Amino acid sequence: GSHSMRYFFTSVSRPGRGEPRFIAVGYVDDTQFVRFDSDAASQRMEPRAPWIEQEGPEYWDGETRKVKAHSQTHRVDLGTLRGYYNQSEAGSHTVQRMYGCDVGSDWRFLRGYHQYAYDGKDYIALKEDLRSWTAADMAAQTTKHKWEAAHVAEQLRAYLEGTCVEWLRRYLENGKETLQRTDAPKTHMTHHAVSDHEATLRCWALSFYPAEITLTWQRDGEDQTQDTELVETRPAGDGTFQKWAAVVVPSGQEQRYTCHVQHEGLPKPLTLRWE
């Protein structure tokens, strides 16, 4: 199927003393593979997947240099934005950045992106054409003008269509044993009586990868969302994901209800019923 490489960055200013907290994470699909935390002792980019550990010292030196450069850019940005928005030096503020590239099933470039936020709201983002910028307000319009004059989108486009995709493919091969493996959800149903006349049926999907999944309840063959609850997909902590969906039903009528599970690891969707 399709694949992605994405990097996430957060910087949080610390007005009482010192530099912003800076945290960077890199993902291939739903697998974290590198991290940098300004509060950690190494002050290096660190591996978080076995298949990246085989990269040599030139790689780790270069990723450390670049991630520290990202952190200083964010530090400067927090100052710039405090001034743009005429804000006091005494408050804590946040910048967030995410960029990356997608490839299709043929591993050819599909799309690229680069998004930036201040205090949890859109600030500036690269358009899908990888040529121009979407500015959310007039401060970001100032940034857009600066970045247009400095050829920023050109450099970023070249990375997103070239380097980003080329290294994604490298990682996909080096980590093929996990990155190119789908883990179909392990599914089961539980039953929880609510009264003499009602029960909750809960449809479980466990230990699946990637995280994308659809759980749907049907009654007598038609979708039902009334009296259902669907929790956010959540990490198991071992690299896989979990989700459940529940419905309240009249006791004795459980056979009308079916849970339907769609996932990339399933050739055909699964149907579960309470017996």
Partner: peptide
């Protein structure tokens, strides 16, 4: 691999 130097805003 990271992008080399995103510029300050």
């Amino acid at each position: 691999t990271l992008f080399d130097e995103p510029p300050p805003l």
